[PDB]
Design a binder for this molecule. Sequence first.
Ligand SMILES: CC(=O)O[C@H]1C(=O)[C@@]2(C)[C@H]([C@H](OC(=O)c3ccccc3)[C@]3(O)C[C@H](OC(=O)[C@H](O)[C@@H](NC(=O)c4ccccc4)c4ccccc4)C(C)=C1C3(C)C)[C@]1(OC(C)=O)CO[C@@H]1C[C@@H]2O
Ligand SMILES: Nc1nc2c(ncn2[C@@H]2O[C@H](COP(=O)(O)OP(=O)(O)OP(=O)(O)O)[C@@H](O)[C@H]2O)c(=O)[nH]1
Ligand SMILES: Nc1nc2c(ncn2[C@@H]2O[C@H](COP(=O)(O)OP(=O)(O)O)[C@@H](O)[C@H]2O)c(=O)[nH]1
Ligand SMILES: [Mg+2]
Lengths: 441, 427, 345
Amino acid sequence: MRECISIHVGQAGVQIGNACWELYCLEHGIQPDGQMPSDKTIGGGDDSFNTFFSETGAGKHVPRAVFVDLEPTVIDEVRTGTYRQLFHPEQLITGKEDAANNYARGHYTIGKEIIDLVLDRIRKLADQCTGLQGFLVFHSFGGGTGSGFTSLLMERLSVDYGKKSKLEFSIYPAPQVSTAVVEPYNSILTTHTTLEHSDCAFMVDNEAIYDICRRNLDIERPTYTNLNRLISQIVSSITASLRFDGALNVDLTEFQTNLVPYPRIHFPLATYAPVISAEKAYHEQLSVAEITNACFEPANQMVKCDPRHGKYMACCLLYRGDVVPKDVNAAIATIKTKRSIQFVDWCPTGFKVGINYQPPTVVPGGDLAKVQRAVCMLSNTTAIAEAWARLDHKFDLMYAKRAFVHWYVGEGMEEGEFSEAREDMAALEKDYEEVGVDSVE
Amino acid sequence: MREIVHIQAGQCGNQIGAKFWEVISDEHGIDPTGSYHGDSDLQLERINVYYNEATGNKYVPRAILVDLEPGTMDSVRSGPFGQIFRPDNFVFGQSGAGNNWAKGHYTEGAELVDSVLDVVRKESESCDCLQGFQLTHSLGGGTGSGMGTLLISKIREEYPDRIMNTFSVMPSPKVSDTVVEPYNATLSVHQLVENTDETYCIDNEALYDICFRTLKLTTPTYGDLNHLVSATMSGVTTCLRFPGQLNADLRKLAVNMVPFPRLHFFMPGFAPLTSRGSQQYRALTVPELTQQMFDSKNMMAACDPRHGRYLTVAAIFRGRMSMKEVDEQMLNVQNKNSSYFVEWIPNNVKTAVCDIPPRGLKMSATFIGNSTAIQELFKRISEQFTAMFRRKAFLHWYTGEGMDEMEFTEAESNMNDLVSEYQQYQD
Amino acid sequence: NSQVTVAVRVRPFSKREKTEKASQVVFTNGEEITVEHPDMKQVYSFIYDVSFWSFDECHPGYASQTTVYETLAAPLLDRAFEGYNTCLFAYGQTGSGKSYTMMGLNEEPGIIPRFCEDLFAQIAKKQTSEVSYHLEMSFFEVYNEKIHDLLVCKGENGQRKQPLRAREHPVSGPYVEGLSMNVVSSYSDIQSWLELGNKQRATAATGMNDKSSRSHSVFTLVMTQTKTEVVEGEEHDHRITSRINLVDLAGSERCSTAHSSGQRLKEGVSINKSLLTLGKVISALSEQANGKRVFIPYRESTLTWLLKESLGGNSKTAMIATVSPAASNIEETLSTLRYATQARL
Ligand SMILES: CC(=O)O[C@H]1C(=O)[C@@]2(C)[C@H]([C@H](OC(=O)c3ccccc3)[C@]3(O)C[C@H](OC(=O)[C@H](O)[C@@H](NC(=O)c4ccccc4)c4ccccc4)C(C)=C1C3(C)C)[C@]1(OC(C)=O)CO[C@@H]1C[C@@H]2O
Ligand SMILES: Nc1nc2c(ncn2[C@@H]2O[C@H](COP(=O)(O)OP(=O)(O)OP(=O)(O)O)[C@@H](O)[C@H]2O)c(=O)[nH]1
Ligand SMILES: Nc1nc2c(ncn2[C@@H]2O[C@H](COP(=O)(O)OP(=O)(O)O)[C@@H](O)[C@H]2O)c(=O)[nH]1
Ligand SMILES: [Mg+2]
């Protein structure tokens, strides 16, 4: 009745999906063979909730998702791995060639040949759904598939569907760390195309999760299997009101109404405060006040953006477990009491609240602990302009000499587009400077 | 699938390939009969990246051997790992080159290049999505320089959308293993830079220094030198064959390591290398490997990077290791050694990781670097070259075979212009 | 010393557009050229060393076809009489009236005919029984980084388009092997040659118009000064040579919007590569005029490699860019301005 199609573009999106569909399939009791051991015993119920998972008559539960990577190295781990009998074999393993970390390849060259199949699978599911609301598009700035292809997909989903939600979780580029040299070019050419079409685009930084893991969880040598699980917990808290039942249900249409004031500033941040290990899971009460004070605490945020260098515009707070609203009220009072946390002079409310009764589940072989309650904060700030400027300086430093451009023209990017796109990001860096101003009566 | 065609030309390329295949077969589990006797199953998933199939569950490689005298081809055949090569691909002729770049580019090379292309077309048309080509060739010599460059020129017209790599063995500073190193190497460079994507510039003095200092060997034969180049060649094409956390391939590195097209001359490097005794007193971690790689006593280019600013750097690691260690140690390298890096490129490094390492190591690493030091390899040649050409020393062996003095000054000016191009980003 | 003398020319509305009511988006204020959207949000403003505002006949600063010649070219011809090589460029998508600006009409000449006629007129005024002036020419093109000559005919077969190759002379400079060169004494001779060259040129439709241009085209004039001067034996003919060039470049062609596929994609790629390299060349030349020390990458494209000795050195370069003032064509008009702007700085 309330479905959401999950699109996973690239290696990042696919590994994150392997984490998400592990967590979800653990919650509802699904085994990787696609079956329920409970429904055969109790003889009823829909704990395998139909927001994410479909159902046929033989007693299986197939997910509502499709994978696409433009390379066969990743999806051939799923096909040949543990979750091979769950997914529909229509995963796009169009493994001719990668996008070469070139936005041009994944937007016109190898962006064709693959898209008119992707759209013919998103449409078989939407015709299989009755009350669809959303398109959760996991992708990654920097990569060619994750940037060109995701932008191309957004262009296709805004012409055929229209009045729907289209969201984005994305690995924003770390300021110091990087696995590529032309990350900024692809990022800037992405935000010029994923602006008018997307509704709310979340953002994270692997440097921030690295600093979280070695300071909260006591892990000195982490890896992506220890990060994508936290991202999966974010996505589960974001997408829990559609699965389980709680007092205050917050759907996906409620985010873009409360966190996106103007249509161009839809770039919030995310955080999740209890990241403590079993040893640290004790020695601590885990009350709503501690969590709600941790979610605003720097060094627990998931982007290297000191929010004390800027102001906030809105903050959604999605809670889970044994929470009483009185404590949330007290905590929000305590937060609005302080002065280090500046709010704008046109959003005194600045808060949305959402509660669910289900606790979060513990993935075996994982790093987190068992909690009676958990929290996720979406937060829009005027601080993130710092990173757009830090990303524009790099673009300018390289485009003055015009390096790494013959690879983009070689696949059909003229010359104006680098210049034209960078003039569209100055407007966004200027809007954030406008909203930070206090009005005059 | 992505697929490579491996051409190899001359006394260097044959002897290198005869060990590189003997290395890839160990990795993927093939024996001298062409049959599979492995233990795992990831060895067959991407065996089509190099090999082709046969009837009795055998595998035959995509090798194209193009010498101009059979004295070396008859050594691969009568060797350990020669009976697997397709006998219709032992291409050769007679009337050898005589270390004359003209004899292997105009007169006695054009009479055989069409026979090589008749094999290249067969071995390309039978491939779903070709990624590019390889080549192993020695500058200074004959066939490997001339016929190699001619094959590059004649491939770049038919398959320009694809990649062409050449693991060039460049000449060395101190000792000349051939008297006509400059006059051949200059004209090989003049034909490479216009018609290549990424060439790896190997030198032999560096490999001597490596095998003597690090590996602590007293009798380094060339079977031990090529044994390194093979590791590098494997490390480059690893994520194209095995899986990992963050994949990579040839074209991604070509985007990240070639800012402008002419500047695609790289220094390679492999880690970890140690003596058969001194392996008991070293730790296997990412920072140790990084220390060994960014040191100058491992780079095979015979040129010190400390004389130059790095323009762009790549790293390909193989093993179950952490990503934070890589993303931290590389940032540390850029921070402490900033003067050895450029400023108008903010991040001069990239990474790639595979989760299937080499047969005997818990983890490995591989290094590629574009540097402004490599000008010294050509600044020397243009010094060696013109001192000969100022008074036409050996030139009569080249005008005799259909050339002219203009074709020398062309390359002499091109190389100098490239030296200027690199020197622009030195101060 | 090296200069670039960027300029822009805005055409007036055509009868087609005055009937169809095409809007106006580009405006002027002296040296400012502003571009205002129909209703979008904002405006960009561009500065150039020279500007030509041919929108309205009654505005001040109306740049007619005569003032275009008396402000850009004539310095090149009064500099070529000194002994220096010159290069004039041209850039603009189809419809902006490049042809109206360079060649022109029978009653509204462009730059080419006024240039050649002022030349031939200065010859006879500047000619004696000892001094002379011999003029040979050429007309060639670039197609996917392959040189081609246009004066010679092609046979009725699949193709007679022989790809001549470029070479480097050690003293004079780069050149082409097999370039036909013909002689001129009256502009009718050059007209009879271009009326064949532009017929033999590459041109095709992609998605917007049936008559376009998909190949750079160079028109070179070699000029000589065989003067006899010595009072010992009436010999020692001290001769000076000059190379004038008037190239007509092509469109930049965002490919996606056209969905290019096949023998159009390659062409767009190669054209845009040549544009990118020429941009670096002009920018670094203007930066070299200010006393810096930098590298001009002529070798990354055939066109620059065949003009190493005409742009650099003690030579003069010039560029005029054409753009339409309509609102229908505004993504292809902003590009031109940004291109020529970076060519200026
Ligand atoms: C007890 C033990 O650890 O044996 C090691 C060993 O002693 C060392 C020194 C090996 C040894 O290699 C050498 O000593 C060597 C060095 C230069 C030239 C020729 C030989 C080794 O022979 C080489 C071999 O290298 C490998 O890891 C792969 O087996 C190697 N395969 C081949 O090269 C090969 C060649 C012919 C036939 C079959 C396989 C390889 C390396 C990279 C990529 C692909 C394959 C290994 C682990 C060892 C020995 C065997 C002692 C080292 O090898 C490499 C390539 O890293 C040399 O330094 C490393 C460190 C290892 O500790
Ligand atoms: N959080 C997280 N980020 C990842 C993961 N894998 C890759 N990334 C990010 O992805 C970025 C690079 O883009 P790619 O991973 O190559 O995305 P892609 O779609 O495969 O792009 P191409 O390789 O060009 O096809 C890196 O900077 C990583 O930070 C992952 O498993 N988890
Ligand atoms: N590394 C290595 N280099 C070699 C080998 N054999 C020859 N060379 C080098 O190749 C050069 C000689 O060229 P050569 O191969 O004989 O010319 P060709 O036969 O026409 O290709 C010299 O610089 C040698 O150092 C070898 O087995 N290993
Ligand atoms: Mg990828």
